[PDB]
Design a protein around this nucleic acid. Structure first.
Lengths: 388, 393, 390
RNA sequence: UUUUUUUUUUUUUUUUUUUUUUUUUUUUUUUUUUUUUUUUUUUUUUUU
């Protein structure tokens, strides 16, 4: 009877989700040059990393080069850097041309072995490096000068350094695409952790100016974020020992997950998991039916789910908290009142519902020790008064 | 209805844990030299141990050599030292070259395996040893100098000594990777135990100077800790004999378990097992869900669990002190009030909720143990003495 | 709900107990020489016992020799002494080479089995014996010197004496590895019993000096204690008749069981079994959950259980009383108050919490000795008078 | 015939304690002793 209606709401939500989109929708693939370390021989590997860091640091380099550079910077981990990119990278927007870096023995620029027209390319590289130095007023990518110069000849030093720079990229990702302004506080907080825990060697700190410029580039460019999120999903999967490098990535993942899906999680954390007396109110019923549909939907979206927001995934829109407004307004009202540090994150959206905002606030604090009825039941007063 | 939400929180927590991880995640492996006991003949075993002690003492050895040295030092236990390392040690960041020492013919150091195209191998060693002596102002590994010169000749003395030094490595692990500063009081307290119980042989006691240098080495090297945790898991398993060597390790283990997962166990010990009427609080329902999801998660992570922190294991993040809600403040508020040993611990965490941390204190201290209250279990005959207990409180 | 948490605590406690340990963990073996009785005729048996008493008494003997001597000393029981050692001895740190010495006509030492590659074996023995005499200032194994001299010629005298010496080894075990100082009072208390009961033959009484030297050897050698505990377990098994020999072992056992697991037993006896009205007190509920996990764990450890501490068996650490602090501090507070003989144990340990201990004391004492909650009903109508008397 | 709104914004490495310490045997009492059986009473009587 009424069961039909509820099932119909769910039917609408899932209708036309299935099947496969017609191939004509596939957009014109954009060609990018991606340098990959040609072997794990430290002289080439260090120089190639420095080249790539400088490409990203340059005021003069074009976006097509800069994406390719960012991909080099966050593939330094691999035993076979080019294989790692090619094998994980699964994105219709971008078509990579992979250059196995090799002997970086053409001075400051990366090696290029095609011949006479590549002599222009090496001089493009030279211009890029010069302009990088000059435009930054002598500050290189790293904060402490000696480190920028320091030639590495052994695997041990190499991995110490590479892991350190990579971790400094992955520091960013967590906030680059949820709000890359306001970003510094959080990214410093995460940096402090990795250094204090001795996972990252602080001599290799990369300069705030460069990191901000790169964070913005990551926010604005999809192709880079696609590769990052591909790797972030792949190494999050369990059932294997890792190298210190992939381990640091995976560890950072536990900050990166759910990020920029705030609303979805806010209704889950506050209101739903809270299981407040408010939930009995008639107004909520429609919203509860909605959330049921949402939870089953979330399941169906599957492996990309922890990073829906970072991937700009459209299905993300369905999960967005604005979708269930009564419960969300109550979920803000509880959260802001009850959980001391939260609620400083700005939930002042236009669709916030005054009744629920006041009722949510009133719910926790107005009742004391669970209000009308404690969840899982003499001495439920004085102590309760002091607590809230 | 509501059951779906709880199951969904659990779903999120386990999502993507499944399958087998894509091969491209393989990290660049670091090539590292492990000298390993070639035969169990006392003069070579003592000399190799002195080499290794000095590698760790040296200002002049590189960290790549020092990790490999630490692996030699804490493999001295074995009947076949090199086999023990090679067969248990299974962590991808490090790729071992194993060199079986032929009782170290040359002098202080290891002998050149095939004869030295460059005999400077032993000189790199000589420099390492000299720099070690010189930088340490002559101070030898042991607290009593006679030990430093011993030149041991018999199995019995050798095992007495090796067991003693190994135990002195394993004393460190317990704190090296949870708080390598503030360590001294605890690590001395554990040393005193093993000596007083006559398990560990005090003639061979190792100097605070040596122990600090090695504690630092442990903190700063992952590769070493990986081998240590591999062995620590392996010997924790039952179903055999234990020899004095493995027994000392296993004994150390009972201090080492759970360590630096403070927050996780604290919610279990304080708040949960405490069974305070306080669970009934509104905020509590969610927090209970988190623990259930967490507890079932912990189970599923399995073998690594007792040492998550030390192994840098990511899932550890979920177990993290910060995330647990009401307990992260309420479980501490109770714990600090009720358990005299607790609270000496540093509880500076940003996740603590002040109001809820005092409610936990109040819940216990309400009657000085909730006297004339609580006592949920009613298996007890009599109702009278609740009041008496409250008066005692 | 809450049930999950309790089950999880239990899961942690049993996690990783399972499986069979990888072979690399096998510890570097010590080679020890054990002289055993090659024959059943006293002439040899008395002389070999004197040799062995002196090996243990020696200031100049190596620890490797001393362990092997102790194994000779506490295998004199057997009809086939070598078989008894070889067949029960099952500990990985130590590998025995056993040569059953017949002649023993050398003097103080044995007679070298196949003849010695060096006659210096016999001279090593001579050094051992000389150093033993000299270092002891001539005070011999026995308390009355005639016994030390007495050459033994008959089975009857032999068994009387061997039983006597063996019992003097087994009196030590009970305290050597729990409290090897403070020892004398207890070991003498047990000696008095065996002699007064005429089970062990006082003609063979062994000197305080000898007994302290052997007690110290037991404390400082693990390999010895392993063999002792192995024998102590093996002969404790029922379904056999026992002769004077096995009977003295089994008798010693009644002091030896539970020993050095003090804390575990005390919480069971005092506080827990006592079922004081305070069990329900919320403060202890997890403690109680803890102890339950402990008890079920203890069961699971099985065969070694009555001697875990003496075996240095790891799992023992978990069982150690510091582990359940609230319950323990209260189990002591009660125990000290209620049981007149207890409390003579030094419990000045870090786990004891004054407030909870004072609760144990007052709750028991002001309770009028656990009158706080009595469990007994159906005996009949309650005596108010009796309650007041208590 | 139909008419509204709908991206995001917080926090998240950690820090305690944890070897043990008692007392353990035995002691009292142990057979029996009393009593016996039987004995009394026991047809009927009015009226129709």
């Amino acid at each position: 009877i009424f069961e039909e209606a509820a099932s119909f709401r769910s039917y609408q939500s899932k209708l036309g989700r299935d099947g496969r989109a017609s191939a004509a929708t596939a957009t014109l693939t954009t060609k990018i040059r991606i340098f990959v370390p040609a072997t794990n021989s430290p002289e080439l590997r260090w120089e190639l990393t420095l080249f790539a860091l400088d490409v990203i640091r340059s005021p003069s380099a074009a976006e097509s080069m800069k994406v390719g550079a960012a991909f080099t910077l966050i593939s330094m981990y691999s035993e076979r850097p080019g294989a790692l990119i090619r094998s994980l990278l699964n994105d219709p927007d971008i078509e990579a041309v992979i250059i196995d870096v090799g002997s970086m023995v053409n001075g400051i620029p990366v090696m290029e072995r095609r011949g006479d027209k590549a002599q222009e390319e090496m001089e493009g590289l030279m211009r890029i490096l010069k302009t990088a130095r000059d435009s930054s007023k002598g500050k290189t990518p790293f904060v402490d000068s000696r480190a920028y110069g320091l030639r590495i000849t052994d695997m041990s030093t190499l991995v110490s350094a590479v892991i350190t720079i990579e971790a400094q990229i992955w520091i960013l990702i967590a906030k680059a695409v949820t709000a890359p302004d306001t970003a510094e506080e959080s990214e410093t907080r995460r940096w402090a952790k990795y250094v204090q825990q001795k996972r990252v060697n602080p001599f290799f700190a990369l300069t705030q100016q460069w990191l901000t410029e790169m964070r913005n580039l990551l926010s604005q460019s999809l192709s880079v974020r696609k590769f990052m999120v591909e790797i972030l999903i792949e190494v999050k999967k369990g059932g294997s020992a890792k190298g210190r490098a992939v381990e640091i990535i995976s560890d950072i993942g536990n900050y990166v997950e759910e990020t920029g899906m705030a609303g979805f999680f806010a209704t889950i954390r506050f209101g739903l998991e809270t299981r407040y007396p408010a939930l009995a109110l008639n107004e909520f019923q429609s919203d509860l039916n909605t959330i049921k549909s949402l939870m089953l939907l979330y399941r169906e979206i599957g492996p990309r789910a922890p990073y829906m927001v970072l991937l700009e995934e459209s299905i993300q829109t369905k999960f967005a908290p604005g979708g269930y407004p009564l419960l969300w307004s109550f979920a803000m009202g509880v959260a802001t009142t009850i959980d001391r540090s939260m609620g400083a994150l700005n939930i002042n959206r236009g669709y916030l519902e005054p009744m629920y905002f006041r009722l949510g606030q009133k719910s926790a604090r107005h009742h004391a020790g669970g209000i009308d009825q404690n969840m899982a039941n003499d001495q439920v007063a004085e102590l309760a008064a002091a607590v809230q």
